[PDB]
Amino acid sequence: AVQKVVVHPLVLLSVVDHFNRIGKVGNQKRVVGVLLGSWQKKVLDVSNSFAVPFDEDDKDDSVWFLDHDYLENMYGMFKKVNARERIVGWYHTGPKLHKNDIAINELMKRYCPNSVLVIIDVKPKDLGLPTEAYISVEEVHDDGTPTSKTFEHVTSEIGAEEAEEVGVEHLLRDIKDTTVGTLSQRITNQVHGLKGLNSKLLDIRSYLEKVATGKLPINHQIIYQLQDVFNLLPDVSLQEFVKAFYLKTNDQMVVVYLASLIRSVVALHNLINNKIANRDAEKKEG
Amino acid sequence: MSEKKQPVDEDNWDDDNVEDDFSNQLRAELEKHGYKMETS
């Protein structure tokens, strides 16, 4: 395999309304329903999906039920009314996974050989995009365990469609179009500096988890390696960027030229009609 | 205030100081000093 996904918010509301279907009744654990999908390339798409009744008792996390007859009858309806659509996986509303999810996944990989799950949150405040993709494949193990069948975080994104926001941006009414030039950059400053480096501080919290704990899979495979991709910049004290300040002066050069010349011409913009219309409105007032 | 007696009774203003040296001196400047190479 999967490149990434294309997921419209329509199917997310198709999770939300069934969360309304279960929020009125006894919610045991969470929602598990079908994720239909439009798989064409190694990229993915989802235009629609549906749900299915489900309970689970947490004693061996193996007593859990869908209705495959209901799944294939309503899938026969939706396949009948739309030949484009097919199943691509499932979803769950509780944002943390558990051990049964490989039995859900591998139990429904019999219909199509991939069955991607979707993490969402019905009350999201801290995540970025809600949508999430795994794939249940193996890297065996370095020790080669008996089939360490593993979910893999395939990258994920919100999909888009022409004329799908006809509802949406009319509904929300709150959008300030083109806040370039005012405070959007510092919204992204607070949220990327703070909300980026706090994630860095939870990764260094996981480093302390390797200090006092974390011997499970101490993970000396990807961590220092892509952290050496990070360590393309060893930015230690004395800072060692003598070969970057004439670079910085080259970067500052043209832009401060544009501010000098161009903003002098911005003065040349305001002054003419400001004076002429000024004294028109001044000495032509009486 | 202003009068009290007086109602009864890139240009040259840029150049006139060097043009003074173009007014009294060095008329045939490198044409006698230009002639120093062969007259002397």
Partner: protein, 229 residues
């Protein structure tokens, strides 16, 4: 004034604010604050264009440009020649000619010859560093011309009688930051040189906060000007 300086909230009639900045800039003439005086006396010069055809703008320019001659360098003054000025010989055409020449005999012939009109100057502190402005105009012209110059050339070509007197003038020139000269005090070498990095790497992009601070000031003066009707 200096303990209780209070100037206008808003400027008055431009004749009054013009002549007012001429008065206080004419105080900074004798106070010898040469930086502010050239721009407030330039401002005051250009800001009063209306005058009687026999003068008072040549009075304002005449008694304006004396310390501008005393800056060590001057441009060739204004830009609009006046013949009744030429009859009155007010701001000394011949003396500023003696300034841009490195001359001393005709210079002090202007000084000694016209002293009844130097009474009409009333600012005899002009000459006491204006002969010094002749010699600094000479060393500034020659030093500005040559890449390297030596005391064997200038110290007796300008007849300063000795190496060390020119080393004192270049001591005051490096003290004034005029020249990037050096002097080997062993054989008598002014081992003078010219510094480098005239490119627009850093200095104009630093200057653009003065250029654009100026521009935003005129933006806001245009806005406050718009606030009136």
């Amino acid at each position: 004034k200096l303990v209780s300086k209070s100037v206008f909230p808003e400027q008055a009639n431009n004749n009054e604010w013009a002549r007012y900045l001429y008065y206080t800039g004419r105080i900074k003439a004798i106070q010898l604050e040469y930086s502010e005086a050239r721009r407030t006396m330039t401002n005051a010069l250009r800001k009063a264009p209306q005058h009687t055809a026999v003068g008072f703008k040549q009075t304002v320019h005449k008694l304006l440009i004396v310390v501008e001659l005393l800056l060590g360098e001057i441009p060739d003054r204004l830009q609009f020649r006046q013949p009744s000025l030429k009859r009155s010989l007010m701001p000394y055409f011949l003396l500023t000619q003696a300034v841009r020449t490195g001359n001393l005999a005709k210079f002090n012939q202007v000084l000694d010859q016209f002293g009844e009109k130097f009474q009409a100057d009333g600012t005899y502190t002009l000459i006491i560093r204006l002969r010094h402005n002749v010699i600094k105009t000479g060393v500034r012209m020659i030093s500005l011309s040559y890449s390297r110059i030596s005391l064997a050339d200038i110290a007796q070509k300008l007849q300063l009688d000795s190496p060390e007197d020119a080393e004192f003038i270049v001591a005051k020139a490096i003290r004034d930051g005029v020249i990037e000269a050096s002097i080997n005090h062993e054989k008598g070498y002014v081992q003078s040189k010219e510094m480098i990095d005239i490119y627009s790497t850093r200095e104009p992009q630093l200057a653009f906060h003065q250029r654009i601070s100026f521009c935003l000031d005129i933006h806001n003066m245009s806005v406050k000007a718009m606030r009136f009707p």
